[PDB]
Structure formats: structure tokens, C-alpha cells
mmCIF file with all atom_site columns, C-alpha atoms in Angstrom:
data_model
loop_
_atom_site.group_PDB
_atom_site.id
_atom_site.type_symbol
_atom_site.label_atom_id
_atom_site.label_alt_id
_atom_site.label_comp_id
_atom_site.label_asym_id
_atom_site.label_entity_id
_atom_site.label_seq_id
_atom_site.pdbx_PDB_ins_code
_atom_site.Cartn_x
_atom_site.Cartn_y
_atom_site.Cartn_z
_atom_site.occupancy
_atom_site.B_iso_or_equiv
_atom_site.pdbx_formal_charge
_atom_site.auth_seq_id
_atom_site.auth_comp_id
_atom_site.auth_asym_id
_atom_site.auth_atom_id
_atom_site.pdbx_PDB_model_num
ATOM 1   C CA . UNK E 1 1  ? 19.486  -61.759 2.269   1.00 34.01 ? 3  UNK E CA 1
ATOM 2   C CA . UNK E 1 2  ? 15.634  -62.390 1.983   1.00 36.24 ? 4  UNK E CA 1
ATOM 3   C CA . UNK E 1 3  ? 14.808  -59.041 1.946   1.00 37.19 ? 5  UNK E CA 1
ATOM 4   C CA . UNK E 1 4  ? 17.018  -58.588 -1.407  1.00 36.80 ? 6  UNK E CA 1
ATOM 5   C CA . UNK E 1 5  ? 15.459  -62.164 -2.917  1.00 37.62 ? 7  UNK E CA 1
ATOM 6   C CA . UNK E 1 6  ? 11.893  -60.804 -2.705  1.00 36.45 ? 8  UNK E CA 1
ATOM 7   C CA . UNK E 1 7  ? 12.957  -57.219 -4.329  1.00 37.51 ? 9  UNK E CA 1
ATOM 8   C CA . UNK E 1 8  ? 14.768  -59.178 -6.885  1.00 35.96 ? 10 UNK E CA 1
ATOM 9   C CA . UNK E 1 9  ? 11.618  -61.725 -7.517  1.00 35.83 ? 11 UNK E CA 1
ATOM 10  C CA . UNK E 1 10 ? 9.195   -58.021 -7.780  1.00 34.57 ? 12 UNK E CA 1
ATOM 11  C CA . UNK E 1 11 ? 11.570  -56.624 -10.090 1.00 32.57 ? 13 UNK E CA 1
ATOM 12  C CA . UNK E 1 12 ? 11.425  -60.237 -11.903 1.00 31.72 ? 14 UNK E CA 1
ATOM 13  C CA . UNK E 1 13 ? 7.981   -60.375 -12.094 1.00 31.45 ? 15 UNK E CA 1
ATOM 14  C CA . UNK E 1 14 ? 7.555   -56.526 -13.252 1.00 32.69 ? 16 UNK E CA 1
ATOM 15  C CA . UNK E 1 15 ? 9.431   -57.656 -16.405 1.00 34.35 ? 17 UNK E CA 1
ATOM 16  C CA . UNK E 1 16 ? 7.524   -60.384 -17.248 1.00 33.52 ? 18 UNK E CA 1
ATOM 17  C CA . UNK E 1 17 ? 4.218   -58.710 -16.902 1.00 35.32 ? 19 UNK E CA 1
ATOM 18  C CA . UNK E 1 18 ? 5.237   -55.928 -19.123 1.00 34.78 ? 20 UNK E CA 1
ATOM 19  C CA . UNK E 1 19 ? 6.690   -58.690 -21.307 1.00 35.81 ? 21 UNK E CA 1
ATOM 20  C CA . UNK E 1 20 ? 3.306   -59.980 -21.397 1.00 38.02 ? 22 UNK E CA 1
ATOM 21  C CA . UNK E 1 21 ? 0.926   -57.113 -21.958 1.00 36.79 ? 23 UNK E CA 1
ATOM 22  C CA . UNK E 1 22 ? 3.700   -56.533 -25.364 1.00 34.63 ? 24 UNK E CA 1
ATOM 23  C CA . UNK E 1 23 ? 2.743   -59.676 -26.439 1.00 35.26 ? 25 UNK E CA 1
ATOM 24  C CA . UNK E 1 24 ? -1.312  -59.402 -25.705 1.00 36.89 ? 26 UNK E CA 1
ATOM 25  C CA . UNK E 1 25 ? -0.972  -56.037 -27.505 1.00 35.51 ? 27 UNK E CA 1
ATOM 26  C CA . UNK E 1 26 ? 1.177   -57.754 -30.316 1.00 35.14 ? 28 UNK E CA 1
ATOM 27  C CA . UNK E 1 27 ? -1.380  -60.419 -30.895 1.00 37.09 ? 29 UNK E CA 1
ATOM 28  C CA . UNK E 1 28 ? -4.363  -58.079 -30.602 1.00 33.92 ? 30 UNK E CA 1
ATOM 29  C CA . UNK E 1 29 ? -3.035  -55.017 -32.686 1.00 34.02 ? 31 UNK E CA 1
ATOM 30  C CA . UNK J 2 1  ? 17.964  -52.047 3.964   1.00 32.24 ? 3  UNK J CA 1
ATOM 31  C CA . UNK J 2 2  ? 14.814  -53.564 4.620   1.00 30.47 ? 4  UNK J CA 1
ATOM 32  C CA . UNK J 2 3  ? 12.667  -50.671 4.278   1.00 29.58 ? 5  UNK J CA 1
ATOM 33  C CA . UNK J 2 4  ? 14.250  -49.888 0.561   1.00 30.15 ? 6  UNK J CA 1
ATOM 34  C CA . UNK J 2 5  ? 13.196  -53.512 -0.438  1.00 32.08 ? 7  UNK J CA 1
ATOM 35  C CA . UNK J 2 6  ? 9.518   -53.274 0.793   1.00 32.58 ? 8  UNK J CA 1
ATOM 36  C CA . UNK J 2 7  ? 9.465   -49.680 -1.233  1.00 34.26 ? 9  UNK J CA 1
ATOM 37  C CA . UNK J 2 8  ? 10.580  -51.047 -3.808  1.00 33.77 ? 10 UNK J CA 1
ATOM 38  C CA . UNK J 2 9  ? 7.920   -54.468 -4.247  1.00 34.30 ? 11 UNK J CA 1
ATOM 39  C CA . UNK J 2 10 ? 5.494   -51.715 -3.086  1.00 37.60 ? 12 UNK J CA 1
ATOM 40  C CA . UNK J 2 11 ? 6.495   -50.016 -6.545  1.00 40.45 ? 13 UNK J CA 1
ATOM 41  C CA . UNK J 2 12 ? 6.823   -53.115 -8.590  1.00 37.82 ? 14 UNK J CA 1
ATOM 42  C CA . UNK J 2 13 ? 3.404   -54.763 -7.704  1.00 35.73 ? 15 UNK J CA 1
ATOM 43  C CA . UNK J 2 14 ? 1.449   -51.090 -8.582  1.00 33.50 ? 16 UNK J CA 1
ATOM 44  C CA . UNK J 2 15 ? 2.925   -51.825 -11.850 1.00 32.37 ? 17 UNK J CA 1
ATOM 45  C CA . UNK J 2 16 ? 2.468   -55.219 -11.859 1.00 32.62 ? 18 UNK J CA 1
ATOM 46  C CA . UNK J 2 17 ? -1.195  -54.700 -11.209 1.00 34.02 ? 19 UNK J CA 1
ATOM 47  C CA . UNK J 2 18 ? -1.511  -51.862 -14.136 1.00 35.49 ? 20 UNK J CA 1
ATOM 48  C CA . UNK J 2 19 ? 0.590   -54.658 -16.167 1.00 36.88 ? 21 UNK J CA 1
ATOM 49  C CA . UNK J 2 20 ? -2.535  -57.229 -15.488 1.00 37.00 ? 22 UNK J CA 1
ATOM 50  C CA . UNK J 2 21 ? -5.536  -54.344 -16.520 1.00 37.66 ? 23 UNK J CA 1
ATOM 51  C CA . UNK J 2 22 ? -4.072  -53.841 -19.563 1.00 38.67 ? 24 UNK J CA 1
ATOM 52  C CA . UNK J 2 23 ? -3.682  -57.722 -20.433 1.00 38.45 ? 25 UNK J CA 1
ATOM 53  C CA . UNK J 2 24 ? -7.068  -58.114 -19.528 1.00 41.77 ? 26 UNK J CA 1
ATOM 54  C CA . UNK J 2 25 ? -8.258  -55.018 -21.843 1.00 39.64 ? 27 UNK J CA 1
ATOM 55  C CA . UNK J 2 26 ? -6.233  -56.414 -24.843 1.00 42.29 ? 28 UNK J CA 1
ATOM 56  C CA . UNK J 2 27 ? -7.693  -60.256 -24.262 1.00 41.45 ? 29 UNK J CA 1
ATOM 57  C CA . UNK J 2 28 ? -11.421 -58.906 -24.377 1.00 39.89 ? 30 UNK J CA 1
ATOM 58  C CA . UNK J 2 29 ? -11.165 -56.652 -27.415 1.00 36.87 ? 31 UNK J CA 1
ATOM 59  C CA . UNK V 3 1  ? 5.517   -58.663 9.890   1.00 35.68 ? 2  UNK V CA 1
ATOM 60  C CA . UNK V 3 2  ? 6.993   -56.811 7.152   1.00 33.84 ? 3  UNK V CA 1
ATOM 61  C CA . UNK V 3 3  ? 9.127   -59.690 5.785   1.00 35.32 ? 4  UNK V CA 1
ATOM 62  C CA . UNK V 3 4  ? 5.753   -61.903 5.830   1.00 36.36 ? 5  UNK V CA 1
ATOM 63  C CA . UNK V 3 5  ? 3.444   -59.699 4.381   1.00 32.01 ? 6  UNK V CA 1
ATOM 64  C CA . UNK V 3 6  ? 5.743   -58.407 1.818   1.00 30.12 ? 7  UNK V CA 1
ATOM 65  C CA . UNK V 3 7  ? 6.593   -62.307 0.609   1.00 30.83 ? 8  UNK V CA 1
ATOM 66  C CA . UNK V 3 8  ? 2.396   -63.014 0.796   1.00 29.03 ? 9  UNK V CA 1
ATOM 67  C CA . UNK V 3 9  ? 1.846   -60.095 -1.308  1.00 30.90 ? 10 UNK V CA 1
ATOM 68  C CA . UNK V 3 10 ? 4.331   -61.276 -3.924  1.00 31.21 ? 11 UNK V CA 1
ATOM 69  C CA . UNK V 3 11 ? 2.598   -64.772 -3.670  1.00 30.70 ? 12 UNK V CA 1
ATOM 70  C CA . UNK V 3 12 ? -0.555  -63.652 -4.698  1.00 31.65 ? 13 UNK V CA 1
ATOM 71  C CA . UNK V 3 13 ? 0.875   -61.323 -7.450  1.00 29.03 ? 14 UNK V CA 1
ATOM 72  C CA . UNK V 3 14 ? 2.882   -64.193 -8.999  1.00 30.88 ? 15 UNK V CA 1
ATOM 73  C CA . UNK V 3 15 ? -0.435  -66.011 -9.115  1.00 30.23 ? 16 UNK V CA 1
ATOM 74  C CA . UNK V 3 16 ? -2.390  -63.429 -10.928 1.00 29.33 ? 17 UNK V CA 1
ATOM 75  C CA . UNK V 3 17 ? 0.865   -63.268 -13.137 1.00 29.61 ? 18 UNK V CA 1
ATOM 76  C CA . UNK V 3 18 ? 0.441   -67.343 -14.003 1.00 26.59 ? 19 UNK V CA 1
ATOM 77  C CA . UNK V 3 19 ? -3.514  -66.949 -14.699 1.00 27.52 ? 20 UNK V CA 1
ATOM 78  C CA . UNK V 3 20 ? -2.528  -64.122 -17.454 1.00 27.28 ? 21 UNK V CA 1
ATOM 79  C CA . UNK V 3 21 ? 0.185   -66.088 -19.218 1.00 28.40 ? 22 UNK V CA 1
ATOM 80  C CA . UNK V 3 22 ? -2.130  -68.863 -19.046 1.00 25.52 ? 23 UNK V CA 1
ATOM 81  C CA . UNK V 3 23 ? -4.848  -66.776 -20.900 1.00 26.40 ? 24 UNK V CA 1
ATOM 82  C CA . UNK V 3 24 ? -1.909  -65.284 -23.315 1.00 24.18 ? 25 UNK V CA 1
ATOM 83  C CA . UNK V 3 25 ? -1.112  -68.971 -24.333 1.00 23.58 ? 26 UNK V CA 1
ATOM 84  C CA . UNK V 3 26 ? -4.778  -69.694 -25.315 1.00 22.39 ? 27 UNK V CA 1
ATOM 85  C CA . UNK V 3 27 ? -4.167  -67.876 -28.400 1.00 23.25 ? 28 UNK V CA 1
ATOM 86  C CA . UNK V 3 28 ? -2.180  -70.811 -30.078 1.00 26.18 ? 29 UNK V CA 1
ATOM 87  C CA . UNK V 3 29 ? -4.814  -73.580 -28.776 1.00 27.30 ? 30 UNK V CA 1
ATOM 88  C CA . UNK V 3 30 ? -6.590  -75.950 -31.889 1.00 26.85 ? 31 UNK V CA 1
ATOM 89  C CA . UNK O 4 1  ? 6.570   -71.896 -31.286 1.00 22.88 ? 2  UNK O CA 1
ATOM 90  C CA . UNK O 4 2  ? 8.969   -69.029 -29.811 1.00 25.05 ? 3  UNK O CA 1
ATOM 91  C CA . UNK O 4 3  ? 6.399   -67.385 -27.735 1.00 25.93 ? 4  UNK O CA 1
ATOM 92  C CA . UNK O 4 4  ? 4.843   -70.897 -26.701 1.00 25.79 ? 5  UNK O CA 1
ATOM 93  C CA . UNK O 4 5  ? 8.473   -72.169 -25.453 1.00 25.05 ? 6  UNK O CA 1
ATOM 94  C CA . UNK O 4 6  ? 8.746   -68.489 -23.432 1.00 23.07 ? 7  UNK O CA 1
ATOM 95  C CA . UNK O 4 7  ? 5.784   -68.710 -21.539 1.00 25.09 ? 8  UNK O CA 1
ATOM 96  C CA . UNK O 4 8  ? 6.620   -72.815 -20.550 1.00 25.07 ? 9  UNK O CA 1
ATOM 97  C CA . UNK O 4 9  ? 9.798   -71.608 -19.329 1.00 25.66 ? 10 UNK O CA 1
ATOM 98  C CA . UNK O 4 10 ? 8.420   -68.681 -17.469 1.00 24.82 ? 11 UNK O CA 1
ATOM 99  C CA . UNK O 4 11 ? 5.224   -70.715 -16.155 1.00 22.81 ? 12 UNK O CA 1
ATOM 100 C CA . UNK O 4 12 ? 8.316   -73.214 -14.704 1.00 24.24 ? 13 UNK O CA 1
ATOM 101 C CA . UNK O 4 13 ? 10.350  -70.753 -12.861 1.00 22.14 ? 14 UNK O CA 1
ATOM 102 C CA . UNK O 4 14 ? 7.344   -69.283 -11.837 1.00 22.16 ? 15 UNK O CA 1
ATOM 103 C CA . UNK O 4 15 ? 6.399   -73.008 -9.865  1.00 24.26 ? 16 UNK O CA 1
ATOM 104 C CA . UNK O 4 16 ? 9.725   -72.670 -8.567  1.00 24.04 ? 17 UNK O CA 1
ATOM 105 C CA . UNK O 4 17 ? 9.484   -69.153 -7.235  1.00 26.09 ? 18 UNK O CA 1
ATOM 106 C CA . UNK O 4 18 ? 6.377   -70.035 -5.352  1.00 24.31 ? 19 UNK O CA 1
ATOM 107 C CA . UNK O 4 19 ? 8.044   -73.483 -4.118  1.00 24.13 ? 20 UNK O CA 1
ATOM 108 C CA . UNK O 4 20 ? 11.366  -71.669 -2.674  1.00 24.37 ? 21 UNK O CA 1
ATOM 109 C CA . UNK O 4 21 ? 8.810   -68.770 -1.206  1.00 23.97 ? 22 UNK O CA 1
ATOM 110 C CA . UNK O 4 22 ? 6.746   -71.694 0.821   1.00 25.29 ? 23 UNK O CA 1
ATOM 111 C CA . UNK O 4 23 ? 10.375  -73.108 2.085   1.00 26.86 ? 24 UNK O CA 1
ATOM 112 C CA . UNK O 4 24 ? 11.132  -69.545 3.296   1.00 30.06 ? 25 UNK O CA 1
ATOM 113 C CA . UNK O 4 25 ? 7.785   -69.161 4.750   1.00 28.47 ? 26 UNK O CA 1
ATOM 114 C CA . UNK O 4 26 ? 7.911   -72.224 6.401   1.00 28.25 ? 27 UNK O CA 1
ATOM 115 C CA . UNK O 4 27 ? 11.726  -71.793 7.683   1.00 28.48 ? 28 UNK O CA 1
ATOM 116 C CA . UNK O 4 28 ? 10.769  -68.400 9.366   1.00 28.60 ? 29 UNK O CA 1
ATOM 117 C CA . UNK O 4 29 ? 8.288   -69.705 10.980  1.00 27.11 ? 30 UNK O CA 1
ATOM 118 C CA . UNK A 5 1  ? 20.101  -75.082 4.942   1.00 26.79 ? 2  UNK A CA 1
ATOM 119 C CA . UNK A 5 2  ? 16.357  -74.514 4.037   1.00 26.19 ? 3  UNK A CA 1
ATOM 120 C CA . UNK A 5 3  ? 16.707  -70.997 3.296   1.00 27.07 ? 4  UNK A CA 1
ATOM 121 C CA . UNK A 5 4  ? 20.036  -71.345 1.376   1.00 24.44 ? 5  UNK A CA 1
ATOM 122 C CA . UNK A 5 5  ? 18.620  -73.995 -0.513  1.00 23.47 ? 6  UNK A CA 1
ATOM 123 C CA . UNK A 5 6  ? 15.252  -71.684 -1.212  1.00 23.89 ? 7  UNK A CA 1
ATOM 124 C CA . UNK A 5 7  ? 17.844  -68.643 -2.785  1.00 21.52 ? 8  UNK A CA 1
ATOM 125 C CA . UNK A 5 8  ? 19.700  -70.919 -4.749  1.00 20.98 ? 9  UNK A CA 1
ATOM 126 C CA . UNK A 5 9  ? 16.291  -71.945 -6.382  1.00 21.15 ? 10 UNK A CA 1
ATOM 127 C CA . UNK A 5 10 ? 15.052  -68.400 -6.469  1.00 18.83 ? 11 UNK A CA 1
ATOM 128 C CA . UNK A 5 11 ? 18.736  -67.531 -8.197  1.00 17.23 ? 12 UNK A CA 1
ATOM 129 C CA . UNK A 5 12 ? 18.469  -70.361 -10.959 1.00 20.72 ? 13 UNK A CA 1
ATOM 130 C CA . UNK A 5 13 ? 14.522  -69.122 -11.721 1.00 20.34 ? 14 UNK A CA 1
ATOM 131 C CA . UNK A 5 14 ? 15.467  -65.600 -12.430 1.00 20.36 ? 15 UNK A CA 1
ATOM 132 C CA . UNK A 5 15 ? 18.044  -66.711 -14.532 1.00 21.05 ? 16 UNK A CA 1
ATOM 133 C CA . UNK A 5 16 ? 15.377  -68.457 -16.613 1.00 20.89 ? 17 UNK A CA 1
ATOM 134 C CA . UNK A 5 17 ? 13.076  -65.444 -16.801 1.00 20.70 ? 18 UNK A CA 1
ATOM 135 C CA . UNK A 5 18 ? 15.840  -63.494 -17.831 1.00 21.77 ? 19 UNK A CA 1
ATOM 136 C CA . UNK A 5 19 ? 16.294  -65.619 -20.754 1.00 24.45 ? 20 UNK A CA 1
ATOM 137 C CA . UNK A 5 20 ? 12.651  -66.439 -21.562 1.00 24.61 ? 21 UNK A CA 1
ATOM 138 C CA . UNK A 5 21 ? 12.531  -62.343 -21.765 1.00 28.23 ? 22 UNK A CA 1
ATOM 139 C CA . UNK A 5 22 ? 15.189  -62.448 -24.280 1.00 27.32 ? 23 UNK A CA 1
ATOM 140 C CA . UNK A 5 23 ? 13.326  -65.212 -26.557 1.00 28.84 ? 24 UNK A CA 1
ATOM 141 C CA . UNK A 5 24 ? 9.752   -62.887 -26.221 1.00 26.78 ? 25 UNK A CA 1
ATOM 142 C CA . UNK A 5 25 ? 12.220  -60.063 -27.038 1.00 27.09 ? 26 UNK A CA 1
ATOM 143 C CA . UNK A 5 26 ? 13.332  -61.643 -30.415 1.00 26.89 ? 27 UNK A CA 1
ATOM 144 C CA . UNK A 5 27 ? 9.888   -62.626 -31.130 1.00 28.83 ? 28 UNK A CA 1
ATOM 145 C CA . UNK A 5 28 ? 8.475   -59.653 -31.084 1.00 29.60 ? 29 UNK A CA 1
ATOM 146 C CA . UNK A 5 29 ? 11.139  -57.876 -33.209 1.00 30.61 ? 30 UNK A CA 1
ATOM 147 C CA . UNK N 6 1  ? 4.926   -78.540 -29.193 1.00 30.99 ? 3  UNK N CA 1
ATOM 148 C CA . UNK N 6 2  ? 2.319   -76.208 -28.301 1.00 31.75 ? 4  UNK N CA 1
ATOM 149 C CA . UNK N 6 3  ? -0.233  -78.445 -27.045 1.00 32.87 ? 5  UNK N CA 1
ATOM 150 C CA . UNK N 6 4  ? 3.430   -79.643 -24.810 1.00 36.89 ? 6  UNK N CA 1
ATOM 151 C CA . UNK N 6 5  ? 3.975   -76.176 -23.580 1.00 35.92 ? 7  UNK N CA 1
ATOM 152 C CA . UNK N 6 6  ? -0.218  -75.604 -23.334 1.00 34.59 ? 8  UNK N CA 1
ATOM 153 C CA . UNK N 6 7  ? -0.057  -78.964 -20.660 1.00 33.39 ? 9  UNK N CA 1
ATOM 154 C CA . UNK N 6 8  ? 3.302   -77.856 -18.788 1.00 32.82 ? 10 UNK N CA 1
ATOM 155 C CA . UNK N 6 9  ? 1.788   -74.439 -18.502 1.00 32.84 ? 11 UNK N CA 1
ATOM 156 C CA . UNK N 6 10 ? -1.772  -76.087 -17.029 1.00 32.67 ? 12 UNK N CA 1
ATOM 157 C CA . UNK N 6 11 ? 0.114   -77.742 -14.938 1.00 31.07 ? 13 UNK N CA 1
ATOM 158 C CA . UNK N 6 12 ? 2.756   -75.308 -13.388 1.00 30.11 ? 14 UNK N CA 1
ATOM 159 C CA . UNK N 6 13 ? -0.420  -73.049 -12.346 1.00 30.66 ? 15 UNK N CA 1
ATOM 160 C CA . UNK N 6 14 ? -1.616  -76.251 -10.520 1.00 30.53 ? 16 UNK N CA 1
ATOM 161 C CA . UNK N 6 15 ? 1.843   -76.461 -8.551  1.00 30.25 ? 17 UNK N CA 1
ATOM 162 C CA . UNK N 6 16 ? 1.650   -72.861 -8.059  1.00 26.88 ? 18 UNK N CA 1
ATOM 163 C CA . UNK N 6 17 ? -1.969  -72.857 -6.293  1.00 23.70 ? 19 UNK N CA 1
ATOM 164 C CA . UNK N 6 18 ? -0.644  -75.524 -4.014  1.00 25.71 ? 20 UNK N CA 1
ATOM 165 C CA . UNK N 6 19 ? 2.239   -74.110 -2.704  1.00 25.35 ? 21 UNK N CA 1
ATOM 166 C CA . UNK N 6 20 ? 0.227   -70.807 -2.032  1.00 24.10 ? 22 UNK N CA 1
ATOM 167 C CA . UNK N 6 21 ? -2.064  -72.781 -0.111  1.00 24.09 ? 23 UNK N CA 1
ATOM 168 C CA . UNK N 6 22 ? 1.813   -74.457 2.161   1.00 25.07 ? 24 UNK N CA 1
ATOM 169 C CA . UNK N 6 23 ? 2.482   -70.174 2.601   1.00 23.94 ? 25 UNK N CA 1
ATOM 170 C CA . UNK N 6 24 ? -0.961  -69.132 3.220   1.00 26.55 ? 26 UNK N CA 1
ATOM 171 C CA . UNK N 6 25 ? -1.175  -72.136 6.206   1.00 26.49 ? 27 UNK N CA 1
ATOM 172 C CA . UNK N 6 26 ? 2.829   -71.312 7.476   1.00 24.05 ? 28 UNK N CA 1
ATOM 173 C CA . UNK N 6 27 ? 1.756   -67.534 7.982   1.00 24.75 ? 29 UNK N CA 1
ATOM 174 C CA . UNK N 6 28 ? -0.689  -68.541 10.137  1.00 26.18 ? 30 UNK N CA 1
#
């Protein structure tokens, strides 16, 4: 289904912003 | 259902967004 | 339509994700 | 190095996301 | 065909975020 | 390998622009 793809790719792309900010904080603190 | 996967990017793309701001904040400082 | 809109929005989202990793990576530049 | 390789691989599937999301625009329309 | 094709991609990218998370994951440990 | 990753990165956010531009113009 495309309606589950594009939950799946929000979801996806949740994780790697939070993933991201962790590092930025990381690096910064 | 449909409507469960448009609540559900709804969700993830508010956090996504928060996410962002707080990259942003850590990549000035 | 909802199936439109909801795959634009994620578009644009995934774009503002690239610019930050982008920005993230700078660190390690020489 | 670790965090350099992440964010290639994640920039990549990223390109690929967007790529598939343009076929499935397109294929709706 | 084209939207197939489109899932298959989407399928193969998430499995490459999942595992770039993993490597940030171990990083930041 | 940085400055690899650095250009691979560049360049996936050029690939990425594009195809916004192919969903922005199929929505129409």
C-alpha cells in the first residue's frame, strides 16, 4: 500500500532527525 | 486505514519540525 | 487529495532533513 | 569517519526516497 | 510496475537508514 | 574519506532538489 510506504518513510525520517539533533548536541556539548 | 497513516505523518512531521529547531539552535551556539 | 498532499508534505520535510545533515557534516570540513 | 560514513549513507537513501516518491507521484497521476 | 518498482526502492532505503542509525548509535556511545 | 562522503552528500541534496521539482510539476 502507498498509504503504509509514506507512514513508514515519516516514521523513517522522525528517526533520523532525532538521530541528528543527538549528534548536533554531541558535537556542541 | 488511510486516515491512521495521514495521523500518523501528521504526528511525525510536528516532530520532525521540533527535530530541525533544535539542530538549528545547537549549530548557532 | 489526501494521498497527494500527504506525499508533498513529506517531500518538503525530507528536504529540510538533507539541508540539516548537510550543515551537521560541515563540522569535519578542512 | 563513523559519523561521516552515516550521514553519506543516509544523504543516499534519502535521493532515493525522493526518486521513488516522484515515480509515485507521477504514476498517480 | 512503476509503483511496485517505487516500494521496492522505498523498502531497500529504509533498510539503509535503519542501519546508518545503528552506526550514529555506536558512535555516540 | 570525509571530503568523499562531504561530495556524495553535496551531491545527493542536488538529486534531491530535482526530483522535488518532477513531484512539485506531476501534482500539478
Amino acid at each position: 500500500e502507498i498509504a503504509q510506504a509514506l507512514k513508514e518513510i515519516a516514521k523513517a525520517l522522525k528517526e533520523i532527525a532525532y538521530a541528528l539533533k543527538e549528534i548536533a548536541q554531541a558535537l556542541k556539548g
